[PDB]
Amino acid sequence: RISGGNDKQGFPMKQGVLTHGRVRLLLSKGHSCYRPRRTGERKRKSVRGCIVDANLSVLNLVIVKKGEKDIPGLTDTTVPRRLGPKRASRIRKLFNLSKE
Amino acid sequence: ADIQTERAYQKQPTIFQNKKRVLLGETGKEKLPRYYKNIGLGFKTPKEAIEGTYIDKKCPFTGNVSIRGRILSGVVTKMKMQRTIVIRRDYLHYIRKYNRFEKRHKNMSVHLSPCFRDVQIGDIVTVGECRPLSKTVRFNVLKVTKAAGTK
Amino acid sequence: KNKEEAAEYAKLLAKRMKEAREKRQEQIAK
Amino acid sequence: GISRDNWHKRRKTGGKRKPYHKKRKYELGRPAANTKIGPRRIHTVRVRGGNKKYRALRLDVGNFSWGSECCTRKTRIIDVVYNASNNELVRTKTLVKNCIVLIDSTPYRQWYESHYALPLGRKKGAKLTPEEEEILNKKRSKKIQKKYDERKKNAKISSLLEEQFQQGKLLACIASRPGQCGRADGYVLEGKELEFYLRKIKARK
Amino acid sequence: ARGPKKHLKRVAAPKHWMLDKLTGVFAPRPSTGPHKLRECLPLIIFLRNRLKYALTGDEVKKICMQRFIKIDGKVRTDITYPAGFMDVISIDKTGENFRLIYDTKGRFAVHRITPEEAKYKLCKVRKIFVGTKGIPHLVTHDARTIRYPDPLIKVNDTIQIDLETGKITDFIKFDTGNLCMVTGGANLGRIGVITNRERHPGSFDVVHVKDANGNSFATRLSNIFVIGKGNKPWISLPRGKGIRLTIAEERDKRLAAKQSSG
RNA sequence: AAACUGCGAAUGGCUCAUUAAAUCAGUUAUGGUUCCUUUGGUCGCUCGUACUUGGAUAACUGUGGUAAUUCUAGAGCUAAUACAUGCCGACGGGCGCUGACCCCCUUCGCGGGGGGGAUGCGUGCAUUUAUCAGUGGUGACUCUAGAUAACCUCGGGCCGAUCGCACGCCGGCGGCGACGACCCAUUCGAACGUCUGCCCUAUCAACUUUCGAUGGUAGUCGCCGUGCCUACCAUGGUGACCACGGGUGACGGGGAAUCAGGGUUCGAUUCCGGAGAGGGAGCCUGAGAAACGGCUACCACAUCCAAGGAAGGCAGCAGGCGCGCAAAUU
């Protein structure tokens, strides 16, 4: 699955933008490609459109379904799976425990 | 006279005038109660306000205006708007260097309710301060004293 | 607390209006 | 933006007043809530102090009151027929305060018939369908029929309201500001007010 | 200015605080509370300037954060807490209680009261209104609301609040012949018997007060606080009993005190 | 530590450009509004998983892009007083509307009633609208409280799924706090009004009224009063008692210099009030800003660049240049 990327100038790919090049959007809280520095702040920022073309410095891909052969260091590796559930309900749902 | 000279219906908002009428509810008279209030400070409600039929929401006696603040007096100089008159307050301003006075005046656009008929130029009016009624009106005519020369 | 305050004020109010009615009746008589 | 200040206004002498400060936030105005008739659409507005105003954009239902009978019902708003401020508001069909509307008389007629034994209207002069004679005649006892008959004597309707009920729609005046509170509430026109607004509507055609 | 102000300048502070003009630029801006800004005494002023228990505002902060000061029976840790007329300040560590009562010069006095007098206070009822199923409510000069007051208590009266419970115990009507303090204006701090009340509808009523020494004065009805029934106060009065001496009599008393002392 | 969350950042400080009934001062009003916070009151008043519900996302691990910024993009987790849901009780009931039914009197001579009574609907407080009657209050309410008929916002209102300390039974009960939420109380205010007062100028005598100028009616908008803005209507409103226009090296006042009694001149300047943040304009957040040590654009100026792009606002404290007769330590 194509999960975005950065064009030749490093500007991020934004999902809703249905163009090829870069656009200037007034991003605010709840947007990607923008972290607000104070409450209510919005900024005009350059974002690369979501359509993939031949002018990206890097493109991000998420393997959704694994093929027949393992990649030497991408799919045959082990997982530490740090951290576990902290909320009590999440714990009892993970282990299928009785309510009491 | 017809009190319905406007594009909308004119009524006293606090009076219900279409309570149900039946044979017992009507015996030769329709009846129409009149909302009026006694404003304070010793001012007496004019008879025409109580027994009149005009609709004026800026009238101190039958409208929706509260008389609070300054109670001033003036001389009527112009009666040429609708329900509004121009009075003139004349005073003396003291100049201290000369230890003397100079005549000054201020015009005041004040609301005149239809309860005050036969108001003339030169009449003295006691007006009371209320909330802003228009761009320039902040006083309502509470009392009318006729100019000397009534016979 | 609401119940107690309501009951106590009802008692006090009843006594107040009884005294008021007595003063009114005695003013009327004289 | 939209300013409700006074210093842009000329002086009462006719003099021109110069601006001594830029527009303040508390002096603002907002675009009108041109409340059309349609499926309910209301937008909440954050106003000064953090409070909410309910900017209704479309309404088709209001809590209208039959004053003489003291019968308030929720009722569909069919049309707007008269507007005292501007005639264009009727043309664009905008709900505002004190605009004359045609509302649906059904709930009022249902209560009207539940308080039975009035002069005949459309009860048996325009529709004779079943499934409503068990709320008009029923099988009543002595006490219940006596109470309904005691209602009967003081149970009458002005002829104007009578033909309005016959036509299925009632004339009403909106007594609330839909662009502020989000409700198109009001009262059914009766008495001399109904005659006044009927004459005004007639004189517009 | 946008929004509320949070600073008070030293010279713009209330004069009766008796602050210098050289110990800083700012005066302690009293917190919002039961008493007005210009009619209160901040806890820092009382602990530092009046009682000398602290030499800095930091020491006042230490004293208040050790939870040693009670105001009307409740611990206050706010050093700018507005304490005002008729309030009770209890310091149980040193075992003392003070009442905030005006001097004849119009300044809050250091008026020590007995621990049994510190169990109550007097409040002038500012308004009475019925709300929410007909329950009467009363609002006093401490901005404290009391439900179910006596139906005889009216505006301008005085009520004796028990600080432990918050309930009304007794009340004094606003009537002639009753003792009263003046809590504002030129005659602030004076005590005397109400002799007359001139009603001015649409404006301020004027109340005439006669001193215990035959002196008379007048104030606005909002500046009168009924202290006691008749000519007997319900609280202990300060050193001067509300008698404002002229400058000549004060000079004579000072000279006599100098002669007696040295 | 970091980070999410809460709060503050709307105060302070600087400056005097604008500004001539504007600001400002004294006086008065809000019965024409809003009000974070503090303080006090209200907070089982609602008859219809709860021995605790759901989904994420930071911090962290890991992979990165850009010459460049307090730029940020994918991926793997995991919290809440963030976000979002949502009950048990007191809940026995009690009331108001509705009316399948049961014993009798006018000597039970249709007729006229005297009562009991089944099942159903609605119910705190906010809110919106119509009607009714006349706890407490004011000089005065269309106030407050009460009664009735209904309504109750997708962007939806409150009625607590929160936290600490001290604690003891077959399990039950419970102290003292922290925090949070409607609402009522003018605590701090703010806003908008009343009355009176301001320098020079007539080589400025008529101004306003088109596109609101004065008022009336209905509304819109607004936190609210209001030509505030619309529609219709009327023809008004100000002026030799100086309107209107122009000038000001004009922020206003407290106040300062000088002065026999009068007065003259000054007040950028530490206190109060107003305004502004290069000039205009428009907004977000928020109780509070038309905020500039916030954002968005334009105009002027201007910084870095790998030319793709990025970033800016000292009338804050120092400091520099310029300007000047004229003013200090990075």
mmCIF file of all heavy atoms in Angstrom, chain A residues 85 87-97, chain F residues 53-56:
data_model
loop_
_atom_site.group_PDB
_atom_site.id
_atom_site.type_symbol
_atom_site.label_atom_id
_atom_site.label_comp_id
_atom_site.label_asym_id
_atom_site.label_seq_id
_atom_site.Cartn_x
_atom_site.Cartn_y
_atom_site.Cartn_z
ATOM 1 N N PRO A 85 -0.818 -4.164 26.981
ATOM 2 C CA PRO A 85 -1.980 -3.343 27.338
ATOM 3 C C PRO A 85 -1.884 -2.833 28.766
ATOM 4 O O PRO A 85 -1.401 -3.524 29.663
ATOM 5 C CB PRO A 85 -3.161 -4.302 27.161
ATOM 6 C CG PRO A 85 -2.567 -5.662 27.188
ATOM 7 C CD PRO A 85 -1.205 -5.528 26.594
ATOM 8 N N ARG A 87 -4.704 -0.508 30.102
ATOM 9 C CA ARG A 87 -6.067 -0.479 30.608
ATOM 10 C C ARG A 87 -6.520 -1.886 30.976
ATOM 11 O O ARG A 87 -6.211 -2.854 30.278
ATOM 12 C CB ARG A 87 -6.998 0.128 29.562
ATOM 13 C CG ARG A 87 -8.154 0.908 30.130
ATOM 14 C CD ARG A 87 -9.161 1.231 29.052
ATOM 15 N NE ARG A 87 -8.829 2.468 28.356
ATOM 16 C CZ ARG A 87 -9.329 2.825 27.182
ATOM 17 N NH1 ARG A 87 -10.186 2.057 26.534
ATOM 18 N NH2 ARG A 87 -8.958 3.982 26.645
ATOM 19 N N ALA A 88 -7.260 -1.994 32.081
ATOM 20 C CA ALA A 88 -7.671 -3.304 32.577
ATOM 21 C C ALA A 88 -8.552 -4.031 31.571
ATOM 22 O O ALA A 88 -8.418 -5.246 31.378
ATOM 23 C CB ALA A 88 -8.404 -3.156 33.907
ATOM 24 N N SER A 89 -9.473 -3.307 30.938
ATOM 25 C CA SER A 89 -10.363 -3.928 29.966
ATOM 26 C C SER A 89 -9.585 -4.475 28.783
ATOM 27 O O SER A 89 -9.883 -5.567 28.290
ATOM 28 C CB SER A 89 -11.408 -2.925 29.496
ATOM 29 O OG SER A 89 -11.074 -2.423 28.218
ATOM 30 N N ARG A 90 -8.580 -3.732 28.315
ATOM 31 C CA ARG A 90 -7.758 -4.217 27.213
ATOM 32 C C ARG A 90 -7.026 -5.493 27.597
ATOM 33 O O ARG A 90 -6.927 -6.427 26.794
ATOM 34 C CB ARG A 90 -6.767 -3.137 26.785
ATOM 35 C CG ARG A 90 -7.408 -1.800 26.473
ATOM 36 C CD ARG A 90 -6.783 -1.166 25.246
ATOM 37 N NE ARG A 90 -6.790 0.288 25.321
ATOM 38 C CZ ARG A 90 -7.233 1.086 24.360
ATOM 39 N NH1 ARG A 90 -7.727 0.601 23.233
ATOM 40 N NH2 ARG A 90 -7.176 2.403 24.531
ATOM 41 N N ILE A 91 -6.514 -5.556 28.827
ATOM 42 C CA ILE A 91 -5.837 -6.763 29.292
ATOM 43 C C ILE A 91 -6.802 -7.938 29.307
ATOM 44 O O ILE A 91 -6.513 -9.008 28.759
ATOM 45 C CB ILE A 91 -5.215 -6.531 30.680
ATOM 46 C CG1 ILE A 91 -4.042 -5.559 30.588
ATOM 47 C CG2 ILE A 91 -4.771 -7.845 31.288
ATOM 48 C CD1 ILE A 91 -3.638 -4.974 31.915
ATOM 49 N N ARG A 92 -7.972 -7.755 29.922
ATOM 50 C CA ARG A 92 -8.902 -8.873 30.048
ATOM 51 C C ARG A 92 -9.498 -9.269 28.703
ATOM 52 O O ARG A 92 -9.979 -10.396 28.549
ATOM 53 C CB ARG A 92 -10.004 -8.540 31.052
ATOM 54 C CG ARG A 92 -11.063 -7.589 30.544
ATOM 55 C CD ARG A 92 -12.225 -7.497 31.527
ATOM 56 N NE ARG A 92 -12.019 -6.449 32.519
ATOM 57 C CZ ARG A 92 -11.489 -6.647 33.718
ATOM 58 N NH1 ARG A 92 -11.110 -7.851 34.116
ATOM 59 N NH2 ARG A 92 -11.335 -5.612 34.538
ATOM 60 N N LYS A 93 -9.479 -8.367 27.723
ATOM 61 C CA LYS A 93 -9.923 -8.719 26.382
ATOM 62 C C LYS A 93 -8.830 -9.442 25.606
ATOM 63 O O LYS A 93 -9.122 -10.313 24.780
ATOM 64 C CB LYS A 93 -10.371 -7.456 25.650
ATOM 65 C CG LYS A 93 -10.628 -7.607 24.167
ATOM 66 C CD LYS A 93 -10.786 -6.238 23.521
ATOM 67 C CE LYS A 93 -11.456 -5.252 24.476
ATOM 68 N NZ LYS A 93 -10.972 -3.855 24.308
ATOM 69 N N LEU A 94 -7.567 -9.098 25.861
ATOM 70 C CA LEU A 94 -6.465 -9.769 25.181
ATOM 71 C C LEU A 94 -6.351 -11.226 25.615
ATOM 72 O O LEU A 94 -6.024 -12.097 24.801
ATOM 73 C CB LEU A 94 -5.161 -9.019 25.442
ATOM 74 C CG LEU A 94 -3.917 -9.439 24.659
ATOM 75 C CD1 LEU A 94 -3.106 -8.222 24.264
ATOM 76 C CD2 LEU A 94 -3.069 -10.381 25.479
ATOM 77 N N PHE A 95 -6.608 -11.510 26.890
ATOM 78 C CA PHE A 95 -6.490 -12.856 27.431
ATOM 79 C C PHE A 95 -7.831 -13.557 27.602
ATOM 80 O O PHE A 95 -7.864 -14.674 28.127
ATOM 81 C CB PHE A 95 -5.760 -12.817 28.776
ATOM 82 C CG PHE A 95 -4.368 -12.271 28.696
ATOM 83 C CD1 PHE A 95 -4.105 -10.958 29.047
ATOM 84 C CD2 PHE A 95 -3.317 -13.068 28.272
ATOM 85 C CE1 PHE A 95 -2.824 -10.452 28.977
ATOM 86 C CE2 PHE A 95 -2.034 -12.567 28.201
ATOM 87 C CZ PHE A 95 -1.787 -11.257 28.557
ATOM 88 N N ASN A 96 -8.929 -12.937 27.172
ATOM 89 C CA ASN A 96 -10.271 -13.513 27.263
ATOM 90 C C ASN A 96 -10.596 -13.933 28.697
ATOM 91 O O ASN A 96 -10.830 -15.105 28.994
ATOM 92 C CB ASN A 96 -10.433 -14.692 26.301
ATOM 93 C CG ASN A 96 -9.545 -14.581 25.080
ATOM 94 O OD1 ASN A 96 -8.476 -15.188 25.022
ATOM 95 N ND2 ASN A 96 -9.982 -13.804 24.098
ATOM 96 N N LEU A 97 -10.610 -12.948 29.589
ATOM 97 C CA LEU A 97 -10.825 -13.188 31.007
ATOM 98 C C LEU A 97 -12.250 -12.837 31.409
ATOM 99 O O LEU A 97 -12.932 -12.042 30.756
ATOM 100 C CB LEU A 97 -9.835 -12.385 31.855
ATOM 101 C CG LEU A 97 -8.386 -12.421 31.384
ATOM 102 C CD1 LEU A 97 -7.539 -11.453 32.194
ATOM 103 C CD2 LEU A 97 -7.852 -13.834 31.492
ATOM 104 P P U F 53 -14.584 -1.548 32.322
ATOM 105 O OP1 U F 53 -15.037 -2.912 32.679
ATOM 106 O OP2 U F 53 -13.133 -1.252 32.228
ATOM 107 O "O5'" U F 53 -15.255 -1.174 30.931
ATOM 108 C "C5'" U F 53 -16.499 -1.736 30.547
ATOM 109 C "C4'" U F 53 -17.051 -1.054 29.323
ATOM 110 O "O4'" U F 53 -17.635 0.218 29.693
ATOM 111 C "C3'" U F 53 -16.033 -0.699 28.253
ATOM 112 O "O3'" U F 53 -15.727 -1.794 27.412
ATOM 113 C "C2'" U F 53 -16.696 0.460 27.520
ATOM 114 O "O2'" U F 53 -17.637 -0.021 26.573
ATOM 115 C "C1'" U F 53 -17.463 1.149 28.647
ATOM 116 N N1 U F 53 -16.786 2.354 29.180
ATOM 117 C C2 U F 53 -16.699 3.466 28.367
ATOM 118 O O2 U F 53 -17.118 3.496 27.226
ATOM 119 N N3 U F 53 -16.083 4.553 28.927
ATOM 120 C C4 U F 53 -15.569 4.652 30.199
ATOM 121 O O4 U F 53 -15.044 5.707 30.557
ATOM 122 C C5 U F 53 -15.708 3.469 30.988
ATOM 123 C C6 U F 53 -16.302 2.392 30.465
ATOM 124 P P G F 54 -14.288 -1.890 26.712
ATOM 125 O OP1 G F 54 -14.108 -3.265 26.187
ATOM 126 O OP2 G F 54 -13.299 -1.315 27.648
ATOM 127 O "O5'" G F 54 -14.390 -0.889 25.482
ATOM 128 C "C5'" G F 54 -15.379 -1.052 24.480
ATOM 129 C "C4'" G F 54 -15.234 0.000 23.413
ATOM 130 O "O4'" G F 54 -15.636 1.287 23.941
ATOM 131 C "C3'" G F 54 -13.820 0.228 22.913
ATOM 132 O "O3'" G F 54 -13.441 -0.712 21.926
ATOM 133 C "C2'" G F 54 -13.867 1.662 22.401
ATOM 134 O "O2'" G F 54 -14.452 1.712 21.110
ATOM 135 C "C1'" G F 54 -14.842 2.309 23.380
ATOM 136 N N9 G F 54 -14.199 3.058 24.477
ATOM 137 C C8 G F 54 -14.024 2.623 25.764
ATOM 138 N N7 G F 54 -13.468 3.512 26.536
ATOM 139 C C5 G F 54 -13.274 4.609 25.715
ATOM 140 C C6 G F 54 -12.708 5.876 25.995
ATOM 141 O O6 G F 54 -12.249 6.309 27.056
ATOM 142 N N1 G F 54 -12.709 6.692 24.877
ATOM 143 C C2 G F 54 -13.189 6.343 23.641
ATOM 144 N N2 G F 54 -13.095 7.275 22.685
ATOM 145 N N3 G F 54 -13.718 5.164 23.366
ATOM 146 C C4 G F 54 -13.728 4.350 24.441
ATOM 147 P P G F 55 -11.892 -0.991 21.631
ATOM 148 O OP1 G F 55 -11.788 -2.267 20.885
ATOM 149 O OP2 G F 55 -11.148 -0.824 22.904
ATOM 150 O "O5'" G F 55 -11.473 0.188 20.650
ATOM 151 C "C5'" G F 55 -12.157 0.399 19.425
ATOM 152 C "C4'" G F 55 -11.805 1.735 18.824
ATOM 153 O "O4'" G F 55 -12.313 2.802 19.664
ATOM 154 C "C3'" G F 55 -10.319 2.031 18.707
ATOM 155 O "O3'" G F 55 -9.734 1.443 17.561
ATOM 156 C "C2'" G F 55 -10.282 3.552 18.695
ATOM 157 O "O2'" G F 55 -10.626 4.051 17.413
ATOM 158 C "C1'" G F 55 -11.413 3.889 19.659
ATOM 159 N N9 G F 55 -10.945 4.109 21.040
ATOM 160 C C8 G F 55 -10.929 3.191 22.058
ATOM 161 N N7 G F 55 -10.487 3.667 23.184
ATOM 162 C C5 G F 55 -10.191 4.986 22.894
ATOM 163 C C6 G F 55 -9.674 6.005 23.724
ATOM 164 O O6 G F 55 -9.365 5.939 24.917
ATOM 165 N N1 G F 55 -9.525 7.199 23.032
ATOM 166 C C2 G F 55 -9.836 7.386 21.711
ATOM 167 N N2 G F 55 -9.622 8.613 21.221
ATOM 168 N N3 G F 55 -10.319 6.446 20.925
ATOM 169 C C4 G F 55 -10.470 5.278 21.579
ATOM 170 P P A F 56 -8.179 1.054 17.561
ATOM 171 O OP1 A F 56 -7.756 0.882 16.152
ATOM 172 O OP2 A F 56 -7.971 -0.040 18.540
ATOM 173 O "O5'" A F 56 -7.463 2.356 18.127
ATOM 174 C "C5'" A F 56 -6.517 3.064 17.344
ATOM 175 C "C4'" A F 56 -6.755 4.548 17.405
ATOM 176 O "O4'" A F 56 -7.460 4.886 18.619
ATOM 177 C "C3'" A F 56 -5.509 5.411 17.448
ATOM 178 O "O3'" A F 56 -4.961 5.615 16.160
ATOM 179 C "C2'" A F 56 -6.000 6.694 18.111
ATOM 180 O "O2'" A F 56 -6.622 7.543 17.160
ATOM 181 C "C1'" A F 56 -7.080 6.169 19.055
ATOM 182 N N9 A F 56 -6.674 6.095 20.472
ATOM 183 C C8 A F 56 -6.719 4.991 21.283
ATOM 184 N N7 A F 56 -6.342 5.213 22.514
ATOM 185 C C5 A F 56 -6.041 6.562 22.524
ATOM 186 C C6 A F 56 -5.581 7.414 23.539
ATOM 187 N N6 A F 56 -5.335 7.015 24.785
ATOM 188 N N1 A F 56 -5.378 8.707 23.224
ATOM 189 C C2 A F 56 -5.622 9.101 21.971
ATOM 190 N N3 A F 56 -6.061 8.402 20.933
ATOM 191 C C4 A F 56 -6.253 7.121 21.278
#
